[PDB]
Write a protein that binds this ligand. Structure first.
Ligand code: CDL
Ligand code: LMN
Ligand code: LMN
Ligand code: T7X
Ligand code: T7X
Ligand code: CPL
Ligand code: 3PE
Ligand code: 3PE
Ligand code: 3PE
Ligand code: 3PE
Lengths: 179, 81, 90, 486, 64, 26, 469
């Protein structure tokens, strides 16, 4: 099925990556600026960037691995919870509560929309029209995704929809027959 | 409802909150390269980062995919705000 | 030495028609009241009252309707009926 | 050669009436009035015994780009009618001379622009209901929006900039997701068509996630709950014609599009997901009909009234039952009568006389306008859903159809009769009663044209209210064409 | 049909001459032979595109 | 300002005069 | 028959005087028209996507390349029909928009440099042709020497184009180091599996792509476009984009590319939110260039992008071309004229344009609705056919960000209309002199293509089917 994540290992890897990103961004901020600056103001007039790159990188993947472990599956919801944690880190820079709540809701919704589609900026090679079976089916095959048939099996639609509303395992007229 | 919901909070997710969101994010990407009237040195120290940041970004990617997503969110944060 | 040409003779714009006389005396208090009410969203802020209303009508009330609508889905079948028969399905 | 000669004659007649006469108000009236004589004769030759599409034509085929085509290979743009498609054309064509009339003695500055824009955004919503592809339905689903943008921006009352931006932005923003869901089923099926797609099933995992792209596209057009941001503030700054044609025609289009697009190929993706439609329709009826109470402006109230009735209507469509479909159609044909009459009352007559739409100035309308206070009351009491008016037949059948599908949501949603009475009668007895106001010089009685419009929009409700069966001859196939209760 | 495909492209030509008059702030009929020029030019474009589509269809017919 | 909803609208107004609400009937 | 023109005209321009330059450009315009009319029967050479390799595995002639090869001559006729023809016959309009002596030479040298990339097979033809066209942009920029902004712009464009030329040459050299051949078909679909080529082929892509305005390095191009005069910039905004984009799209060296997908998203973000608070018209217009050149790395990620690309390129070239020609018409009616090289600078300046004439605003309205994808217009089906390929091949988040980018972009397209239909207070009642006949007939024709191209959409799809498959 799946495999649980090392929360501490992935978190400390991302902590090192966030450290390196903070260092290269502070090095970029020194040189792309004006006025009197030297070697020591790398972390003095840094704008607080290394805290951003560190805290987001820890909180996202820690919340992601923790949510994927306690739910015991992998889908787009884990990216929602992890993006909510990232919005909590990015919302605390502006020390105001309704700002903070808005960052947590909206960045979490944007990261959940990213995670639900496949959590990829690129495409999946397989499982898309050019590289997947499409069109009609040829015989009594299990209708996969991307495919069309003319009549679904009733035992499949009763499993999917339910046994309630109007849908029944026998159509209503031959259920009421004279013998 | 007509003031705390219909005109208050459904315009925050509507045409009032997005006006302020785009105002802030546009102002930051405008001010990316504000000062340094030596535009040659300003654009020329920018071409180096964008073949270094990508070059480290891909190294970080092909060891683990998950640890570039906060990097990219933080790049969007430092770029748009 | 860069001026739009001497060959324009451009004039004033009228909208044309009849000056209808004033059938309404505008009240300054009612006018500024209504201008305050229509453009209310440009000055709205989050307080405890605003947050309480937004918590109820956007979050709690759709969730309550969601519980009622998705639980009680195909229960009731009140088409014919008899006495002692099942009124629900589950 | 013959139909080319008709066009070469008619464009010349148009040119010469442009030359001698100054306005083309008369020739636009003549053309839009002859559209009735055409469409009624189309109604005469309509075979009601067939579910079939009767009058079919392809435009922009390969072998003949400028005109009609009879080939064995079709990649043009299909067009046709049955039943359903035809009741809304008949709703349309008897209303567009009334909006074209509606600003007769009003415009005074670039009138030739204005009536061209109004007639054009009426013809585009004729051909909306003629269309048969998913793209030919969609290429006229937003040919309205340019001319709507410019009809609100110029000729809008005041603060028409923001309203014009909203009528572009919100409709476009919800419309691009409709484009996504059209692209997906045009690369899966390789057919844009309204005839064949009963045959084509899709995987439930595919059918599930293309219903989203159409549902949050009709959530914008009939404005449901995370939308209807834009509806009152496009009304409240619109001109007179672009408010009648908005609220009578543009809103019922997505009532038509939830029937035409969604229900017959999304059959299995809805029954999982109707009890989200019931959530959203109920808390538009509960919420938007409750924010009507606190409204200082007078056109904004009739805007939210339109929202509340269109929220009743789409829990009759989404019932998967047989009374609710017909109830939502008779809502769409009767609200499109009673509502533009109310916009003639608010920004039509009263804004022509006093030019300010705040409610607080307006009381005592009876003592100097008796035969307007009658049109206040009978038209309000027609909007509430008193019987014998055609709004109650629709409200009744749609609440009944939404009571079949889920009875607790129907029992809660039945309170809409109360909630639609509250604000409408509160407005009616503020306007009708009291001493004639201080701020208000006495102006003219309601004139011959602003009675001629009104009595048409009142008889056309009362005939449906006395007999809702006068259009069962069209609809009795489309009562069946959309039920999936096996 | 070829004929309607000529008349429609000629109508596009009449629209070009009309709109080019109306940008220059001229009347509708300013140089009324220019309508004949634009009609013949755009109708010739319709000739060209019509014949290219004919030959393309025949190439598809010969592949069976 | 007497009622709890009148108090809850103090931070919205910026140029509004903020007068005392008194009933028109009393 | 470019070089038959260039070799002849260079001797012809060497001896003609400074007054003859207009009529020289008129001659070259009519020459290009008749090269398009009398020689456009070469479509018959291909009938089933037949491709020729000419000059010995050096040039590659197929039908995609024939279409771009025809498109560039057509837009050059529209550009050269501007310098040939007077706008009005006034003192101002002679001292504005003066063509230099060597300008008409440098256009056709640039078209030689742009055509020898789309037709190119070898890397050495790639390198020599990017050099030829990069020089021609260095000198089309700097030919208005007595302008402060234009000289600063040419000097900036020099060093940035120089860095990206050495980055391309490094990638070409590196691919040569790992495989003996230079041609792209030494790949032939068995290399790429057994060979790490992803880094080379992206660095070759990114070398050209950064020359065009891929958005981490978008700031320098916007500055050059705002600084050149308003007629150099319609040419130097159209030509290098379409020339190298049809190169990179003809030869699909970066499929599934993650770097290209990131920079595609970053382009669609920063273009649509960069154009939002901007008061200069060439700026607004150049970020509309940026988002639309970022519906391009998308198709560059795809495989089989020759309906979406070609339809969208001729859409974009007509729409681009038309809206620049609209503001070139709009400069007569404005009240304030600064800066002789660049007469209208602010989008605040074209207020109340509907009260001056209404049909130029009708034209402006159809082009600005064609940029934002309004369905009865030709600009709609371009985005429709991008999306029938993005979703076809698995790019779903790309599709959502494409949509959000289109919506954020429409907000600053419609600012042009919000400005242009307003009350002005000083309406024109009678203009004594009228605008040139042919130069307004060209814009009327470019409108009626935009508003009536869905007529011929279906013919184009059938033609396309025959001639590329
Ligand atoms: C439907 C549309 C949905 C999207 C737009 C909706 C609008 C939301 C409101 C935005 C807003 O108002 O901000 C103002 C704010 C400017 O502050 P301001 O104008 O001074 O504040 C005055 C206001 O009145 C605010 O003061 P106030 O007291 O009125 O309100 C307090 C607070 C309240 O916040 C709100 O207004 C929203 C509250 C919603 C609550 C909903 C409850 C019911 C459910 O205001 C905020 O600070 C909102 C900040 C929310 C930021 C959300 C960023 C999401 C980016 C999505 C990109 C895609 O904008 C910013 O904070 C800067 C934003 C710059 C862009 C940051 C981009 C970061 C991207 C990170 C990655 C994201 C995921 C990417 C993909 C992941 C995979 C790679
Ligand atoms: C209109 C606005 C609505 C927005 C909707 C966008 C979201 C759409 C996503 C759904 C979809 C794209 C389909 C899109 C098509 C139309 C798109 C329309 C417009 C796009 C804008 C992406 O599906 C993604 O869903 C994610 C979560 O749900 C998963 O997250 C990730 O999970 C972890 C790893 O799995 C990661 O480790 C984790 O990191 C992620 O978290 C991904 O694994 C998954 O690929 C589904 O595609 C896929 O569906 C499956 C069946 O499921 C199909 O395979 C089937 O197998 C059998 C099973 O019967 C049958 O043989 C048969 O049935 C079929 O062979 C595939 O063929 C394939 O096609
Ligand atoms: C969880 C609840 C936790 C409790 C939070 C309530 C909360 C968030 C509500 C957001 C809800 C999001 C809605 C979305 C829901 C999604 C499902 C709103 O707090 C509100 O509480 C109200 C009542 O207390 C106040 O009303 C008014 O009060 C009087 C003036 O404060 C007026 O005199 C009165 O006339 C009004 O009555 C509001 O001003 C206040 O913003 C945050 O409370 C806190 O925020 C912080 C930061 O700002 C505040 O810091 C201060 O504010 C400055 C004042 O500007 C100060 O100068 C400054 O020292 C400091 O910076 C705190 O003070 C506190 O406010
Ligand atoms: C101008 C001045 C000229 C300067 C010259 C001096 C240097 C020049 C070199 C730079 C040239 C310019 C650089 C441009 C950016 C480099 C482009 C780049 O990253 O390709 C990387 C190579 O993956 C490394 O292996 C990248 C790893 C590289 C090693 C990292 C560096 C080590 C640093 C140690 C600290 C990958 O791309 P890509 O998206 O197609 O790759 C994807 C992805 O890898 C797979 O997951 C996908 O499945 C597959 O489809 C594939 O397409
Ligand atoms: C390239 C043309 C197209 C660009 C966009 C493409 C569209 C697709 C193909 C279009 C096919 C084009 C065919 C050429 C059309 C030929 C055509 O109608 O007569 C011309 C336009 O002549 C071009 O303007 C000639 C057009 C430019 C060619 C310049 C060299 C000739 C109509 O001017 P016009 O009567 O108003 O000009 C009048 C008239 O000549 C007299 O009253 C006066 O002497 C004069 O001052 C002016 O008032
Ligand atoms: C008598 C001339 C008077 C002077 C006129 C001077 C210049 C006129 C220049 C252009 C006029 C428009 C001609 C368009 C030809 C397209 C060929 C083609 O669709 O290309 C297709 C493939 O396209 C594509 O992939 C997609 C392109 C999508 C185009 C999108 C915009 C089209 C909508 C309007 C264009 C059609 C309007 C028709 C107006 C009557 C390849 O077929 P092909 O290469 O064999 O076609 C050329 C054969 N030829 C040389 C003999 C003509
Ligand atoms: C305004 C218009 C613009 C749209 C704005 C939307 C903003 C984004 C809202 C948040 C969306 C992100 C939600 C993450 C969902 C993660 C997920 O995995 O969903 C799982 C579920 C299908 O998952 P499946 O693998 O098939 O297994 C369970 C089936 N019951 O699928 C689901 O749960 C349904 C998820 C979609 C719910 C609709 C949300 C609104 C759209
Ligand atoms: C082991 C090693 C671990 C570390 C490896 C990670 C390396 C990641 C490096 C990221 C560095 C951040 C880039 C940067 O330096 O940005 C600063 C620069 C200017 O920013 P600044 O002047 O400080 O602020 C102005 C705001 N108006 O901003 C810039 O203009 C630089 C240009 C952006 C950098 C290009 C990155 C391409 C990807 C963009 C993300 C898009 C994601 C789309 C989703
Ligand atoms: C705002 C700007 C954007 C708005 C876009 C609106 C585009 C509208 C374009 C409409 C052009 C296509 C019209 C379809 C043709 C209608 C028709 O059928 O006319 C008759 C004739 C076709 O005759 P035929 O096909 O041979 O069959 C006759 C059998 N009784 O057809 C003809 O003879 C051609 C007559 C139409 C000529 C149009 C010329 C261009 C008009 C400008
Ligand atoms: C069926 C009706 C449609 C075609 C009817 C055209 C014949 C009548 C034209 C007309 O009279 O109005 C054109 C208008 C007025 O000019 P004119 O009447 O000559 O003089 C002013 C007298 N008051 O001339 C103008 O002023 C037009 C100026 C237009 C200003 C911008 C408005 C643009 C509206 C068009 C939408 C733009 C994009 C369309 C996209 C496709 C959407 C369908």
């Amino acid at each position: 099925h799946f495999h649980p994540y090392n929360t501490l290992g992935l978190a400390t890897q991302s902590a090192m990556v966030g450290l390196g990103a903070g260092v290269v961004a502070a090095a970029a901020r020194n040189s792309l600026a004006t006025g009197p600056r030297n070697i020591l103001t790398t972390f003095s007039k840094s704008g607080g960037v290394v805290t951003i790159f560190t805290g987001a990188s820890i909180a996202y993947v820690f919340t992601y691995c923790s949510a994927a472990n306690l739910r015991e599956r992998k889908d787009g919801w884990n990216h929602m919870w992890a993006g909510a944690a990232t919005g909590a880190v990015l919302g605390a820079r502006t020390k105001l509560v309704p700002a903070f709540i808005g960052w947590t809701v909206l960045c979490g919704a944007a990261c959940g929309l990213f995670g639900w589609t496949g959590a990829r900026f690129n495409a999946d090679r397989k499982a898309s029209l050019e590289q997947s079976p499409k069109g009609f089916v040829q015989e009594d095959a299990h209708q996969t995704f991307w495919e069309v048939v003319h009549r679904r099996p009733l035992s499949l639609t009763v499993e999917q929809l339910g046994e309630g509303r109007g849908i029944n395992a026998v159509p209503i007229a031959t259920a009421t027959e004279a013998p | 409802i007509a003031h705390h919901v219909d005109k208050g909070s459904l315009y925050r997710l509507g045409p009032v909150g997005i006006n302020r969101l785009l105002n802030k994010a546009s102002y930051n990407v405008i001010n990316l390269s504000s000062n340094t009237r030596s535009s040659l040195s300003m654009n020329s120290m920018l071409i180096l980062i964008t073949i270094v940041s990508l070059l480290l970004l891909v190294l970080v990617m092909n060891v683990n995919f998950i640890i570039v997503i906060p990097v990219l969110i933080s790049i969007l944060y430092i770029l748009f705000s | 030495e860069l001026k739009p040409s001497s060959a324009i003779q451009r004039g004033p714009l009228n909208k044309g028609g009849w000056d209808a006389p004033h059938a309404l005396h505008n009240d300054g208090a009612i006018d500024r009241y209504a201008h305050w009410r229509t453009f209310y969203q440009e000055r709205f802020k989050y307080t405890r009252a605003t947050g309480k209303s937004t918590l109820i009508f956007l979050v709690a009330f759709p969730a309550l309707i969601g519980y009622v609508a998705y639980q009680s889905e195909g229960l009731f079948e009140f088409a014919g009926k008899r006495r002692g028969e099942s009124v629900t399905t589950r | 050669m013959f139909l080319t000669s008709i066009l070469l004659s008619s464009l010349y007649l148009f040119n010469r009436i442009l030359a001698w006469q100054g306005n083309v108000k008369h020739f636009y009236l003549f053309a839009s009035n002859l559209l009735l004589l055409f469409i009624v004769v189309l109604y005469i030759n309509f075979n009601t015994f067939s579910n079939s599409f009767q009058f079919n034509f392809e435009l922009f085929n390969s072998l003949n780009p400028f005109g009609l085509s009879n080939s064995d290979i079709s990649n043009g743009l299909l067009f046709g009618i049955d039943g359903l498609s035809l009741t809304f054309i008949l709703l349309t064509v008897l209303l567009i001379p009334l909006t074209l009339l509606g600003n007769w003695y009003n415009i005074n500055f670039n009138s030739n622009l204005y009536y061209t824009l109004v007639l054009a955004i009426g013809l585009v919503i004729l051909l909306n209901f003629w269309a048969l592809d998913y793209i030919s339905f969609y290429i006229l689903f937003e040919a309205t929006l340019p001319l709507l943008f410019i009809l609100i921006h110029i000729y809008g009352s005041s603060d028409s900039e923001r309203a014009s931006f909203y009528v572009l932005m919100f409709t476009l923003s919800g419309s691009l997701f409709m484009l996504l869901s059209i692209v997906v089923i045009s690369i899966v099926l390789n057919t844009t068509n309204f005839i064949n797609h009963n045959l084509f099933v899709l995987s439930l995992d595919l059918q599930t996630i293309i219903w989203l792209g159409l549902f949050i596209a009709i959530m914008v057009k009939t404005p449901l709950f995370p939308i209807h941001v834009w509806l009152p503030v496009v009304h409240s700054e619109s001109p007179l014609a672009g408010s009648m044609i908005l609220a009578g025609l543009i809103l019922k289009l997505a009532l038509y599009a939830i029937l035409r697009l969604l229900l017959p190929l999304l059959c299995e993706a809805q029954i999982l997901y109707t009890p989200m439609i019931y959530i959203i329709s109920l808390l538009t009826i509960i919420l938007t009909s409750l924010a009507t109470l606190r409204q200082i402006d007078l056109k904004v109230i009739i805007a939210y009234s339109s929202i509340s009735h269109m929220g009743i209507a789409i829990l009759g469509v989404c019932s998967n039952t047989s009374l609710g479909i017909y109830g939502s159609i008779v809502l769409g044909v009767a609200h499109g009568f009673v509502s533009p009459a109310l916009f003639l009352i608010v920004g039509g007559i009263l804004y022509d006389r006093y030019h300010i739409r705040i409610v607080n100035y307006y009381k005592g309308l009876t003592t100097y306008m008796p035969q307007l206070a009658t049109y206040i009351i009978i038209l309000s009491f027609a909007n509430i859903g008193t019987p014998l008016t055609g709004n109650f037949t629709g409200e009744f059948l749609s609440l009944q159809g939404g009571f079949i599908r889920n009875p607790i949501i129907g029992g809660i949603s039945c309170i809409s009769v109360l909630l639609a009475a509250i604000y409408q009668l509160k407005l009616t007895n503020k306007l009708t009663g009291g001493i004639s106001s201080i701020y208000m010089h006495r102006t003219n009685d309601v004139t011959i044209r602003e009675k001629f419009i009104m009595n048409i929009l009142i008889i056309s409700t009362l005939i449906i209210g006395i007999c809702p069966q006068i259009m069962y001859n069209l609809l009795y196939w489309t009562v069946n064409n959309y039920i999936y209760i096996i | 049909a070829l004929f309607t495909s000529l008349v429609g492209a000629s109508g596009l030509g009449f629209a070009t001459k009309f709109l080019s008059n109306k940008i220059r702030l001229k009347p509708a009929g300013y140089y009324p032979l220019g309508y004949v020029f634009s009609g013949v030019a755009w109708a010739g474009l319709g000739l060209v595109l019509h014949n290219v589509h004919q030959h393309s269809l025949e190439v598809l017919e010969k592949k069976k | 300002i007497r009622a709890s909803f009148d108090k809850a609208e103090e931070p919205m107004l910026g140029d509004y005069p903020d007068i005392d609400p008194f009933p028109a009937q009393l | 028959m470019l070089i038959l023109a260039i070799i002849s005209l260079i001797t012809f321009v060497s001896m003609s005087k400074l007054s003859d330059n207009r009529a020289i450009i008129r001659l070259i315009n009519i020459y290009l028209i008749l090269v398009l009319v009398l020689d456009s029967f070469l479509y018959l050479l291909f009938l089933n996507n037949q491709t020729y390799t000419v000059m010995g595995e050096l040039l590659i002639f197929n039908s995609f390349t024939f279409y771009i090869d025809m498109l560039i001559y057509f837009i050059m006729i529209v550009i050269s029909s501007l310098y040939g023809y007077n706008l009005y016959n006034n003192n101002l309009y002679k001292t504005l928009f003066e063509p230099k002596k060597e300008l008409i030479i440098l256009f056709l040298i640039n078209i030689l440099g742009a055509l020898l990339i789309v037709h190119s097979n070898d890397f050495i033809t790639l390198f020599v042709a990017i050099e030829l066209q990069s020089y021609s942009i260095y000198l089309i920029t700097a030919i208005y020497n007595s302008s402060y902004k234009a000289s600063k712009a040419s000097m900036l464009y020099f060093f940035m184009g120089g860095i990206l030329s050495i980055l391309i040459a490094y990638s070409i050299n590196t691919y040569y180091s790992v495989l003996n051949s230079y041609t792209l078909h030494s790949l032939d679909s068995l290399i790429i599996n057994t060979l790490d080529l992803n880094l080379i082929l992206i660095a070759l892509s990114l070398g050209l792509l950064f020359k065009i305005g891929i958005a981490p390095l978008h700031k320098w191009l916007i500055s050059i476009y705002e600084n050149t005069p308003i007629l150099i910039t319609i040419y130097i905004s159209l030509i290098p984009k379409i020339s190298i984009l049809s190169y990179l799209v003809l030869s699909n060296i970066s499929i599934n590319s993650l770097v290209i997908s990131i920079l595609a998203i970053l382009t669609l973000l920063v273009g649509s939110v960069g154009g939002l608070l901007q008061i200069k018209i060439k700026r607004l217009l150049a970020f509309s260039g940026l988002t639309n050149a970022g519906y391009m790395m998308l198709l560059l990620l795809l495989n089989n992008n020759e309906f979406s690309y070609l339809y969208y390129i001729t859409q974009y070239s007509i729409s681009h071309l038309a809206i620049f020609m609209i503001i070139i018409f709009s400069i007569y009616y404005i009240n304030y004229i600064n800066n002789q090289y660049n007469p209208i600078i602010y989008v605040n300046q074209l207020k109340g344009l509907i009260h001056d004439n209404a049909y130029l605003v009708l034209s402006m309205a159809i082009v600005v609705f064609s940029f934002i994808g309004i369905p009865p217009l030709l600009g709609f089906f371009g985005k429709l056919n991008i999306l029938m390929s993005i979703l076809n091949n698995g790019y779903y988040f790309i599709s959502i960000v494409l949509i959000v980018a289109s919506l954020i972009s429409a907000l600053y397209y419609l600012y042009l209309l919000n400005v242009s239909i307003q009350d002005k207070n000083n309406i024109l009642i009678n203009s004594n002199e009228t605008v040139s006949s042919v130069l307004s007939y060209i814009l009327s024709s470019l409108i009626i293509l935009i508003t009536f191209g869905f007529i011929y959409n279906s013919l184009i799809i059938d033609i396309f089917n025959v001639y590329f498959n």
